[PDB]
Write a protein that holds these residues in place. Structure first.
Motif, short mmCIF file in Angstrom:
data_model
loop_
_atom_site.label_atom_id
_atom_site.label_comp_id
_atom_site.label_asym_id
_atom_site.label_seq_id
_atom_site.Cartn_x
_atom_site.Cartn_y
_atom_site.Cartn_z
N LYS A 136 0.85 -1.19 0.00
CA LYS A 136 0.00 0.00 0.00
C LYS A 136 0.88 1.24 0.00
CE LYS A 136 -3.85 2.23 2.45
NZ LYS A 136 -3.15 3.46 2.93
N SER A 170 0.75 5.51 -0.16
CA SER A 170 -0.07 6.70 0.02
C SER A 170 0.83 7.93 0.06
CB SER A 170 -0.91 6.61 1.30
OG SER A 170 -0.09 6.56 2.45
N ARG A 197 1.73 9.89 -6.45
CA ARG A 197 1.48 10.88 -7.49
C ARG A 197 2.62 10.93 -8.51
NH1 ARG A 197 -0.93 16.05 -4.00
NH2 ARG A 197 -2.79 14.97 -3.19
N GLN A 214 1.53 -2.72 -17.75
CA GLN A 214 1.57 -3.46 -16.50
C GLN A 214 1.01 -2.65 -15.33
OE1 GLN A 214 5.41 -5.12 -15.63
NE2 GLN A 214 4.75 -6.06 -13.69
N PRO A 219 -1.37 -0.32 -13.20
CA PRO A 219 -2.82 -0.05 -13.28
C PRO A 219 -3.16 1.40 -13.59
CG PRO A 219 -2.14 -0.24 -11.00
CD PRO A 219 -0.94 -0.61 -11.82
#
Lengths: 499, 502, 98, 507, 193, 63, 88
Positions: free
Chosen positions: F2, F4, F9, F59, F61
């Motif tokens: 994960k 964040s 960005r 590859q 997403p």
């Protein structure tokens, strides 16, 4: 052992840190990639926590809180998670001061119970007798849905459905009793509320079916009409034409005897539960019941079995031997309406003493995305009305009551003495996170907007011209469920392997 | 940028965390090792911050913070650092919320000006009532600062030393008090029970021979006692690199013409010269330091006479008498010079059973003298222990919501930063700072606004009224000033560049 | 008081550490001799004390073992004052050795 | 190659980044620790860059150009480096696209040439129009003192600041000629102005209660040698076996000292100043004749005494000439600050003065002294240069506005280069709003609204956050600063972008 | 002895937070992680957690006998047994005491503990209304540490009046427990039907 | 895993940068084409940007 | 906090065996190894042994003043001072 509790707060706060940015229509979406390879994205807090595949047990409780939040208030599943992480972050500095988490958990009891009475003071009590405010509340709450213009006619339909099934003073109102039946075809503007019930399937697709009956009795029969099939091993070999008709007459004799007991019971409409194991009703039995003018509806899903056994007032029939007329229901008129290949069956006029507040609403539409979102669009409208029936009155949303409670709780707690003043004022500082996330997601300045809100609370009031109204049960079930969630966390002093 | 604002708060907190537990009457002592190998133990931050050597530029501002305050107050050394460090704790939380440090520094300036006006209404006066009432509250005022030291046993006796020493060096119309006018001198050995208060100077001399009289004769009703201050000893002269009987007569004749009795010189005397001084009634004093000659001319209104031919009547210091009084069984047997009239300076007599004990009572007595200096200059007085941080926090918290701006959060953090001091004292007193903080607040709300302090010293309650703990009002205003002023200077530094040592 | 209860109680057990170490240096049993000595002295008739020769508890007056009042007073006094100095110090700062 | 040019980009930004918080009167101060182990904190870009001693050659160019800014003008040393290094970041993405650095540097000289022409159009000469003689310099001093702790006491401070400039010839003015002595302790509003020069009064030696401080017209004489009996190092070695000779050699060493000591009395000067400590021997003989003497005087204060009464320094006490003496109108020794301070008053020939400052602490007065230096430069340049321009965002936003319209008529790469240079001018008002705590996002957009309405005088208010005209705020800047800043920043930038390779030899 | 003394303390340190109405709940997690349940019951925690210490298994079987006689106070028995073993480490090592003497010391100490509760035991035969109030206060301590403590004030008269309707043998086969979903906990009533 | 904050960005820009750089050379009639090689080893070439993006393997997403 | 307690106990652990007539004697050795002596006096053992703990030097300096006042029981004072800090 405190390292377990210190790690549980950080692990739970990291979850709420990502969710607090998705609050409101301006919130930021989260990318989720499942292990199977499916890529899904959405701003729903309940959807993110469900597909997250949470492992750590403390973070799993946030899913049950969001589930209980939707099962009671129906709105604010994202905001209730934000308040849970705020109390954990505020209590993090309290642990460094030498405060045992039991006192922190006990301090939230007096803060949560008092915030409910303070919220009722600023709330404006309404009444169910006025339908002008009820329609405007449900219409403006649908601005989050794809259809803005079609939401005008959906507001009075959801209000009138609740007012007929509820009295003046009510508390527990179950919204699962209203079943939304979606069918391909039709339009959004055409919608009807059927009193008794609506099924998901047609009646008879063959020739001879009446498809309509007046003054019919409806009941659930768990039995099924099939030729005898013993569990043992049998062998059937027919070498002659007379042998085939001999076995056929023996089977039709058993198929007719089942239909004879039904005709003597004056059963106009029958219901057979769908079972993929064996055959439900033989084609020979359908021709026998065709001359008897008995309506037959097959392919009944198992989910609707518990729904038909209650609202209809009938009882499930396991065997024909226990089947009696007193266990059936009553229906004034039963007809099958076909609109653009619909052939949907509706039942009205139950007129039973065992009848209860169950009303079915039919949803029609062309594309699959129409009847889909509309089912969830009307579902959120009934939740807003349910909040006003359980607790009368409404408040102005947008983080306004969160600061107003924080301002009044901080001033009234300064008159306390000793420990009462230090710890019990920390609950007011955790309520400012709700208006903060609303200003950040909208691009507004975090600190600047919050200071502007605190300026109008002394002169002005909670309010109204923007047609934004948040029900009181969402704010009531927020602090209530958050106080029990944070308590259940800190009370866990360790996690050990037990098998 | 980021790492700059976060490191400055953590670096200043770690340095300030050393003296937190040491602030109070119950505060904890520390061990200081001198570079010469001697171990010193004291709770005063003036010695701790001076002995501790650190290369951190952020903590050097805290050293200069109490450096200028030590001369003005001296008791706020460790109190201003902890108070200024509490402002940095609340300022760190405001930076993470997106508030610029410029508005944080400007917000602390308005919080100080509003809080000073609150204490100006509640102040009381002592000397404005009666002069005898002034010495009543002043006598027991020095006993508070002496409770954290071994002096606390004898505190009743030494309480009269600080009061009488200031009165002699001050005037009724001028009301000027200075610490340079008070000399603190002590030696190792003896005990603390034999220390008296004597106005004058001690030369630590046995008068070179017992036959000399222990008391100076009035010399036929003369005026005072004329003593000679010279930079050359009385003896036959000798070169510093590598006729005697007639030389003695020439030196004695110059003393009789000037009318001097006691002869004070910087260096020792010949044994043959003191034999002729017995019949001429001319006592001689030898082995006197060079700095001691300056303090004698100030008290006795004398002058420095470099040579024998420069002797004059106006250059001789006039005192009441000079006598040698034995103290206990100690073989020192110093001398006592008295005055019996108002002088321009005084000297305190401090003794102790050990070296560090002498310095403990010497610094503790000097701390009470600086408090008396502010009580005379500032007539308005309040009880400062535990009252200020509790009262100042309640006034700012109520007026914070009426501002409606960025300073509202700066005023809330300012009141919470003030609560660090009473909680720190509560942690030093062995009580829960959570319940003690509001206990001081609630008694000032439901009943009436008064001065109720921390339980460190102890009483039947937390009230400072009966306990007679008073702090200077001008001292409390300057303590919150430099603490707030330096906090704006800490955020004033946006970049730190440290080069090497070549 | 509440916080002063265990502090004063701990001082009484430190007084029995001197005869405990004394019995260990002599080779006897410090648990058996010291415990039985407290029972007789507790209520009435306080005479006998620890004997380092035979290994039993006999009369110190008959054996001729006594101590001065001023000598024993300085032991309890100076040790109680010296222990408060080291316990009070929470930090040690050493300068640069020259 | 291109790697050396990119390496020089981050070197200029690193030096610029340290000077960003130091831009503006309300800007933050930078902490610099010299190898001398002396703490130096200042917001003036000159002193900042001189104490860093950066080994990087291109970063040294930004330091060298600051010395040229301090020489000709002396004001704006921080903004000239920020503007020079800003072109390094704007030209960074242009290098990767294939645009040559010489075409970028060529477009700047055409934009600056057009910008200097617009400065003369925005500079309006005004002297006696809608302004008086006394109120002209007073309104300029209150602008630099605003948003400071002295704003409440600024009423009394302007009267002492204007009189300090008028006390010197308006043809030649220097900031070093105005002395400032910090006095610890006391009220801030009780400070006074001194016409003469003062010193620290470090004299530690006894002999007080003599030499009164009330004089009429005392004569000032400079002292060189040491008048005390015992010398500092050397001595006289005399071996005699006689007892009477032991006392004779004591007076023999004093006779040689009394020789030059008595010659001081023949001059008849009541004031004796020396860079060396004067012992108790000279002050004792001077007490009967009411002659004052003070030792341990700094060398910087001795040079101001020569320019005050027109004195001179002589080695011995013999050949001292009578015209080398000088006298003031009044001499008073003030005890303000728990220390005695000597001062001179009423010197008509004095080319220097001294302004005393009082406050609650030495660190507080240090901020008052430096905040006054920014106000003195505005008062000094008002009478020197009659051409002034509106500052505080006024001129900075207009220079970037005109270059956007002139670029529309220019074709080729120079169109986006001038637009990049016009965008590079936005860093000056940016840091002014960031260092003042104001939001740089909102003010930048709101200021461009009225700025496009045709009025070129709209500035930025430094007191309360808002957009408006600095003409009412009394923010004035001379035209020589804006002209030399664009030339020095472009000349320093052209030398950095012109370096393809950096060669460093070890040895 | 090192594994038995330290091993028994680790067992008592797990359930030490489950004693008293202000205590805390212990969370357990298996390999499947879906069986996790939050409960304060000391018997469930000891029986579910596997232990390889043979000395710790002794307290498991003893706790089963204590749970069959009453069913409560089982946590205090484990904690009290752990405190005696924790202090025994100081009695053996540095106090020079034989372990059998410690065993004989608890025998003489147990007789004094029973005599203290005997002299402090006071009952009132007359005024059975006062005896009913004593059963109310005892029921409040048994319902402590459980979620029922909320409505325990209403549950005080439910369990007190239920026992008074027996008048016979102490066997619990007379009272049958029925649990139906729905409604608040305060809706419970007493029925002899 | 994960991620964040501002770290994701920058990854979304770099992921879409390599994907966008494929069609930048094919824009306009003067644009140029490219070949897409699969794991089997065969390939194809066309000037249509829609065909290249259809067979483009992304590859990340974000792209 | 740990250095002061362990540092004080280490000082008391040296003279704990020298208390009483039946106590035990401590042996010391220097680098020359020829200066080794056997004595139970606390004043000789504490002053001779160097220590790197400044907090331990405070207890030794206090014992120096107490040794000059009485001369007997100095070992008992050092042990009793360590027992109060050990039980802390």
């Amino acid at each position: 052992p405190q390292e377990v509790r210190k790690a549980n707060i950080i692990a739970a706060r990291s979850v709420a840190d990502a969710i607090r940015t998705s609050l409101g229509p301006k919130g930021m979406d989260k990318m989720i990639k499942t292990s199977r390879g499916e890529i899904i994205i959405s701003n729903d807090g309940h959807t993110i926590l469900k597909q997250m595949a949470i492992l750590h047990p403390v973070a799993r409780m946030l899913v049950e809180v969001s589930a209980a939040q939707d099962s009671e208030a129906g709105d604010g599943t994202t905001s209730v998670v934000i308040l849970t992480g705020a109390l954990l972050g505020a209590a993090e500095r309290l642990l460094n001061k030498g405060i045992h988490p039991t006192i922190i958990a006990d301090s939230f009891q007096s803060a949560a119970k008092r915030s409910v009475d303070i919220l009722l003071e600023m709330c404006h009590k309404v009444s169910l007798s006025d339908r002008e405010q009820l329609v405007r509340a449900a219409s403006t709450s649908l601005s989050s849905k794809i259809v803005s213009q079609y939401s005008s006619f959906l507001a009075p339909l959801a209000v009138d459905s609740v007012l007929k099934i509820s009295d003046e003073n009510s508390k527990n109102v179950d919204l699962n009793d209203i079943r939304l039946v979606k069918k391909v075809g039709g339009t959004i503007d055409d919608t009807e509320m059927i009193d008794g019930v609506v099924l998901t399937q047609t009646a008879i697709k063959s020739a001879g079916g009446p498809t309509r009956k007046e003054k019919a009795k409806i009941g659930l029969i768990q039995f099924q009409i099939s030729p005898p099939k013993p569990d043992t091993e049998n062998n059937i070999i027919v070498n002659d034409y007379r042998q085939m008709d001999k076995i056929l007459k023996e089977e039709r004799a058993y198929l007719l005897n089942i239909c004879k007991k039904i005709k003597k019971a004056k059963c106009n409409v029958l219901l057979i539960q769908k079972s993929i194991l064996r055959d439900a009703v033989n084609d020979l039995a359908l021709h026998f019941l065709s001359k008897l003018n008995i309506m037959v509806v097959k392919d009944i899903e198992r989910e609707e079995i518990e729904f038909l056994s209650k609202g209809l007032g009938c009882k499930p029939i396991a065997d024909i031997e226990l089947f009696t007329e007193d266990r059936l229901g009553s229906a004034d008129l039963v007809e099958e309406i076909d609109s653009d290949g619909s052939k949907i069956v509706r039942v009205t006029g139950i007129r039973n003493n065992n009848a209860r507040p169950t009303v079915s609403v039919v949803i029609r539409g062309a594309n699959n995305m129409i009847i889909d979102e509309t089912e969830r669009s009307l579902h959120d409208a009934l939740c807003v009305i349910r909040c006003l029936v359980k607790e009368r009155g409404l408040i102005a949303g947008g983080g306004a009551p969160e600061i107003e409670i924080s301002r009044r709780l901080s001033k009234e707690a300064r008159s306390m003495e000793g420990v009462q003043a230090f710890i019990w004022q920390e609950f007011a500082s955790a309520l400012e996170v709700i208006p903060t996330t609303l200003a950040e997601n909208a691009g507004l300045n975090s600190i600047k907007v919050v200071t502007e809100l605190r300026s109008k609370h002394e002169n002005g009031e909670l309010n109204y011209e923007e047609h934004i109204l948040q029900p009181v049960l969402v704010s009531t079930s927020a602090i209530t469920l958050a106080s029990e969630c944070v308590k259940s966390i800190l009370r866990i002093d360790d996690i050990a392997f037990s098998r | 940028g980021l790492e700059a604002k976060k490191s400055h708060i953590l670096a200043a907190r770690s340095v300030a965390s050393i003296i937190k537990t040491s602030l109070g009457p119950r505060g904890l002592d520390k061990i200081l090792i001198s570079p010469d190998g001697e171990i010193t133990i004291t709770n005063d931050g003036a010695t701790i911050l001076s002995q501790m050597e650190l290369d951190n530029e952020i903590a050097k501002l805290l050293v200069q913070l109490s450096k200028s305050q030590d001369d003005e107050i001296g008791d706020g050394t460790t109190g201003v650092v902890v108070l200024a460090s509490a402002l940095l704790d609340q300022a760190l939380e405001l930076i993470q919320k997106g508030i610029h440090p410029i508005k944080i520094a400007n917000g602390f300036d308005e919080a100080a000006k509003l809080a000073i006006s609150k204490l100006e209404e509640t102040c009381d006066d002592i000397s404005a009532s009666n002069d005898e009432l002034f010495r009543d509250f002043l006598l027991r005022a020095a006993k508070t600062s002496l409770g954290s030291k071994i002096v606390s046993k004898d505190h009743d006796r030494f309480a009269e030393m600080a009061v009488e020493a200031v009165i002699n060096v001050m005037d009724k119309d001028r009301k000027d008090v200075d610490f340079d006018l008070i000399k603190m001198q002590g030696r190792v050995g003896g005990s603390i029970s034999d220390s008296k208060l004597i106005n004058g100077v001690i030369l630590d001399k046995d008068f070179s021979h017992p036959q000399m009289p222990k008391c100076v004769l009035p010399k036929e009703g003369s005026d005072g006692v004329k003593l000679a201050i010279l930079t050359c000893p009385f003896e036959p002269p000798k070169p510093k690199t590598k006729y005697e009987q007639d030389k003695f007569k020439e030196m004695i004749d110059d003393v009789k013409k000037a009318g001097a009795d006691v002869v004070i010189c910087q260096w020792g005397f010949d044994d043959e010269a003191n034999h002729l001084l017995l019949q001429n009634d001319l006592p001689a004093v030898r082995w006197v330091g060079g700095q001691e000659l300056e303090h004698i001319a100030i008290s006795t209104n004398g002058r420095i006479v470099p040579r024998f031919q420069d002797l004059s009547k106006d250059k001789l210091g006039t005192c009441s008498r000079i006598y040698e009084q034995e103290f206990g069984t100690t073989k020192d047997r110093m001398l006592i010079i008295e005055q019996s009239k108002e002088t321009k300076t005084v000297t305190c007599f401090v003794r102790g059973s050990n070296k560090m004990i002498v310095d403990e009572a010497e610094r503790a007595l000097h701390d009470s003298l600086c408090v008396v200096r502010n009580l005379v200059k500032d007539s308005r007085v309040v009880y400062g222990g535990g009252a200020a941080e509790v009262t100042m926090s309640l006034a700012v918290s109520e007026e914070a919501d009426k501002q409606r701006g960025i300073d509202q959060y700066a005023f809330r953090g300012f009141a919470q930063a003030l609560d660090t001091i009473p909680m720190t004292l509560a942690e030093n007193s062995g009580l829960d700072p959570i319940g003690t903080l509001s206990t001081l607040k609630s008694k000032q709300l439901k009943e009436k606004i008064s001065n109720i302090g921390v339980d460190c010293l102890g009483y039947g309650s937390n009230d400072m009224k009966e306990l007679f703990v008073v702090d200077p009002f001008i001292g409390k205003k300057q303590q919150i000033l430099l603490a707030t002023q330096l906090c704006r200077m800490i955020l004033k530094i946006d970049n730190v560049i440290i080069s090497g040592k070549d | 008081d509440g916080k002063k209860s265990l502090a004063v109680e701990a001082f009484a057990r430190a007084l029995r550490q001197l005869p405990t170490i004394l019995a260990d240096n002599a080779g006897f049993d410090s648990s058996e001799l010291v415990s039985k000595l407290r029972s007789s002295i507790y209520n009435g008739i306080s005479t006998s004390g620890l004997d380092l020769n035979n290994g039993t508890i006999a009369d110190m007056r008959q054996l001729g073992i006594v101590e001065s009042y001023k000598l024993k007073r300085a032991v309890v006094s100076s040790a109680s004052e010296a222990a408060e100095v080291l316990l009070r110090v929470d930090n040690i700062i050493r300068a640069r050795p020259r | 190659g291109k790697g050396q040019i990119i390496s020089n980009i981050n070197a200029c930004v690193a030096v610029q980044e340290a000077l960003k918080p130091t831009l503006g009167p309300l800007g933050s101060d930078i902490l610099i620790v010299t190898s001398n182990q002396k703490t130096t904190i200042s917001n003036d870009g000159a002193t900042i860059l001189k104490l860093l001693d950066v080994v990087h050659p291109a970063a040294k160019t930004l330091v060298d150009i600051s010395r040229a800014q301090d020489a000709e003008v002396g004001d704006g040393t921080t903004s000239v480096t920020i503007l020079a290094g800003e072109l390094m970041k704007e030209a960074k993405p242009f290098l990767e696209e294939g645009i040559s650095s010489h075409l970028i540097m060529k477009g700047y000289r055409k934009a600056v040439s057009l910008a200097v022409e617009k400065i003369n159009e925005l500079a309006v000469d005004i002297t006696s129009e809608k302004s008086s003689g006394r109120e002209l310099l007073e309104r300029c001093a209150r602008t630099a003192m605003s948003s400071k702790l002295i704003h409440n006491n600024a009423d009394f401070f302007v009267k002492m600041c204007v009189d300090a400039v008028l006390s010197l010839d308006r043809n030649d003015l220097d900031d070093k000629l105005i002395g400032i002595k910090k006095i610890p302790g006391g009220a801030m509003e009780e400070s006074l102005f001194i016409n003469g020069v003062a010193f620290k009064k470090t004299f530690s030696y006894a002999g007080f209660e003599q030499q009164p401080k009330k004089f009429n017209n005392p004569k000032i004489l400079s002292l060189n040698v040491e008048l005390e009996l015992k010398a500092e190092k050397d001595n006289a070695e005399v071996r005699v076996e006689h007892v009477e000779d032991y006392q004779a050699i004591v007076d023999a060493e004093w006779q040689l000292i009394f020789e030059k000591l008595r010659q001081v009395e023949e001059t008849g000067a009541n004031i004796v100043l020396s860079k060396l400590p004067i012992g108790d021997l000279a002050t004792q003989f001077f007490a009967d004749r009411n002659i004052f003497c003070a030792g341990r005087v700094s060398a910087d204060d001795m040079n101001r005494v020569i320019q005050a009464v027109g004195g001179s320094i002589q080695s011995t006490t013999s050949d001292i000439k009578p015209e080398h003496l000088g006298t003031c109108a009044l001499f008073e020794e003030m005890q303000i600050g728990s220390e005695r301070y000597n001062l001179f008053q009423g010197c008509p020939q004095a080319k220097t003065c001294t302004l005393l400052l009082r406050g609650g602490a030495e660190q507080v007065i240090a901020e008052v002294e430096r905040s006054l230096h920014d106000a003195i430069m505005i008062v000094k340049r008002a009478l020197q240069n009659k051409l002034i321009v509106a500052g505080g965002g006024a001129t900075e936003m207009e220079v970037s506005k005109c270059l956007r319209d002139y670029s529309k008529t220019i074709a080729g790469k120079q169109q986006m280069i001038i637009n990049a240079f016009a965008k590079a001018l936005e860093v000056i008002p940016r840091q002014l709003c960031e260092n003042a705590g104001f939001d740089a996002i909102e003010i930048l957009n709101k200021l461009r609204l009225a700025h496009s309405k045709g009025e070129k005088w709209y500035g930025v208010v430094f007191e309360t956050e808002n957009i408006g005209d600095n003409f009412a705020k009394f923010v004035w800047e001379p035209a020589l600063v804006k002209i030399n800043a664009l030339n020095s920043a472009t000349e320093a930038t052209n030398l950095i972008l012109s370096v393809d390779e950096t060669i460093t030899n070890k040895g | 002895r090192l594994s038995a003394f330290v091993g028994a303390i680790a067992v008592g340190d797990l359930v030490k937070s489950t004693l008293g109405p202000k205590g805390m709940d212990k969370l357990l997690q298996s390999a499947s992680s879906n069986t996790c349940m939050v409960t304060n019951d000391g018997a469930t925690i000891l029986k579910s957690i596997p232990l390889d210490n043979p000395a710790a298994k002794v307290l498991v079987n003893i706790s089963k006998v204590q749970d069959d006689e009453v069913g409560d106070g089982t946590t205090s028995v484990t904690v009290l047994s752990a405190e005696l073993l924790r202090e025994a480490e100081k009695l053996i090592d540095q106090s020079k005491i034989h372990p059998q003497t410690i065993i004989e010391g608890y025998r003489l100490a147990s007789a004094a503990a029973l005599d203290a509760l005997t002299k402090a035991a006071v009952d009132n035969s007359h005024d059975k209304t006062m005896f009913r109030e004593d059963l109310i206060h005892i029921a409040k301590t048994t319902l402590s540490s459980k979620i029922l403590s909320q409505d325990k004030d209403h549950f005080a008269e439910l369990a007190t009046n239920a026992i008074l309707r027996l008048k016979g043998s102490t066997n619990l086969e007379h009272i049958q427990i029925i649990k139906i979903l729905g409604g608040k906990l305060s809706d419970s009533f007493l029925d002899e039907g | 895993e994960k991620i964040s904050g501002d770290d994701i960005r920058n990854q979304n820009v770099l992921a879409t940068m390599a994907v966008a750089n494929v069609v930048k050379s094919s824009l306009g009639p003067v644009g140029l084409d490219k070949m897409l090689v699969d794991d089997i080893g065969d390939f194809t070439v066309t000037n249509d940007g829609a065909t290249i993006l259809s067979l483009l393997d992304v590859q990340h997403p974000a792209g």
